[PDB]
């Protein structure tokens, strides 16, 4: 439970690291679930990707601690929930890619500022089979990942530790992680369904230096 906004209930972690503080350390301002917009998962939906903390420069006391702090240091605690009934079938891969250097298809030109920086809007995979960077989705379970199989569960929980070689980073140009939700098995029902996928990001162990 994080912040005055009681949203979801957690205690799956990642990299064996529950976040601890390894100066401004927010614990009631930023440590709260910033629920994003719920994206409509249909039958022909390819994927979605949110680059953290680029998705949180806009929203909340974390967003004020980006515009008023030059260097940040934060781990995350993320929570994806896919509210579908007992007649929907489908499977998501909620994968959290560290340093997702995306690729541009078929050209020699690197991605620009308006292909990598989206923010709260998120984005969408174009070739999700190779994760938009030439690798493979079939091997993409080496990351911190979690399965939303709508037969079994409908929710996910990944913890994202501080993933930089640097001790602290500046937020408006670099993005550590990349939450990415790829429907492996596409959604099915006979009526032919816009099932929503709600993403709540909660920062953990925030530090901010340089007013």
């Amino acid at each position: 439970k994080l912040g005055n906004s009681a949203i979801v209930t957690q205690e799956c972690c990642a990299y064996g690291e529950w976040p601890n503080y390894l100066p401004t350390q927010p614990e009631t301002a930023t440590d709260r679930f910033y629920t994003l917009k719920s994206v409509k998962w249909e039958a022909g939906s390819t994927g979605w990707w949110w680059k953290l903390p680029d998705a949180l420069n806009n929203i909340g006391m974390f967003g004020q601690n980006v515009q008023h702090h030059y260097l940040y240091r934060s781990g995350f605690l993320i929570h994806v929930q896919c509210n579908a009934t007992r007649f929907h079938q489908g499977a998501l891969l909620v994968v959290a890619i560290p340093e997702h250097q995306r690729g541009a298809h078929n050209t020699n030109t690197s991605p620009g500022f308006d292909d990598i920086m989206k923010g709260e809007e998120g984005g969408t995979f174009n070739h999700p089979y190779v994760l938009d960077d030439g690798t493979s989705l079939a091997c993409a379970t080496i990351f911190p990942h979690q399965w939303i199989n709508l037969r079994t569960n409908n929710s996910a929980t990944i913890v994202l530790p501080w993933m930089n070689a640097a001790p602290m980073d500046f937020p408006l140009r670099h993005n550590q992680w990349t939450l990415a939700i790829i429907p492996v098995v596409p959604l099915g029902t006979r009526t032919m369904s816009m099932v929503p996928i709600t993403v709540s990001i909660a920062p953990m162990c925030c530090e901010f230096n340089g007013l």
Partner: protein
């Protein structure tokens, strides 16, 4: 090692990274090389299995010599000078910058064993960001994935001897070999062919295997 699957043993095979048959006669009289991971795609695909690395590269300059289509091969003196990511490179073959009292040259003859220096962990951060999801500097014009805390350095190599060296072409091989490798956060192996040495663009082959829409070669049916 204990097993042959250990990361110190998996990566520290000495690999060729540069090969410049530079012609010296009486800019083009020498070569430099930006030391980067992204040279030869046999080693590049192994270093891009990991996100963060921390390796002391050793550099083993092998210098040969060959007569063009005079019967003896002259034993020249060379200079492989490691310019880091800091001060200037020599603009000419015999400029002032070769005589620098800070860039650490080596002075090796051809008839010696191959020269060998060990460039240490050369970064600002605690690891090499192989993949960088950000932008350099401040502008929107900073290219994607280019971190200044990733360039190991430069390696300007020249023939120390004076001109009129007549048409014996000098082919210089340079072998990088990581040491003390500590590797963090593994990644999926790249399955589509490369486009550039700068970024992770993807095009695929025309048909499977290693294509965009089908990575394994197509069998006839699932009951094959």
């Amino acid at each position: 090692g204990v097993s042959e699957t250990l990361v110190e043993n998996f990566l520290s095979r000495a690999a060729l990274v540069s090969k410049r048959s530079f012609e010296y006669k009486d800019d083009k009289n020498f070569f430099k090389w930006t030391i980067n991971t992204r040279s030869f795609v046999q080693l590049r695909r192994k270093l891009e299995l990991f996100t963060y690395l921390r390796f002391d590269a050793e550099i083993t300059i092998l210098t040969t010599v060959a007569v063009n289509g005079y019967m003896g091969l002259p034993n020249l003196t060379l200079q492989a000078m490691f310019v880091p990511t800091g001060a200037l490179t020599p603009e000419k073959q015999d400029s002032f910058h070769w005589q620098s009292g800070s860039n650490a040259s080596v002075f090796f003859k051809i008839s010696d064993p191959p020269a060998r220096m060990t460039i240490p962990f050369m970064c600002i951060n605690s690891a090499y960001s192989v993949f960088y999801d950000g932008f350099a500097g401040f502008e929107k014009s900073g290219l994607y994935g280019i971190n200044p805390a990733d360039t190991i350095g430069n390696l300007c190599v020249r023939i120390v001897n004076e001109h009129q060296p007549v048409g014996f072409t000098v082919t210089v091989r340079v072998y990088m070999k990581p040491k003390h490798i500590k590797a963090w956060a593994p990644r999926p192996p790249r399955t589509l062919p490369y486009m550039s040495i700068a970024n992770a663009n993807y095009k695929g082959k025309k048909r499977a295997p290693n294509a965009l829409n089908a990575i394994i070669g197509n069998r006839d049916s699932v009951k094959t």
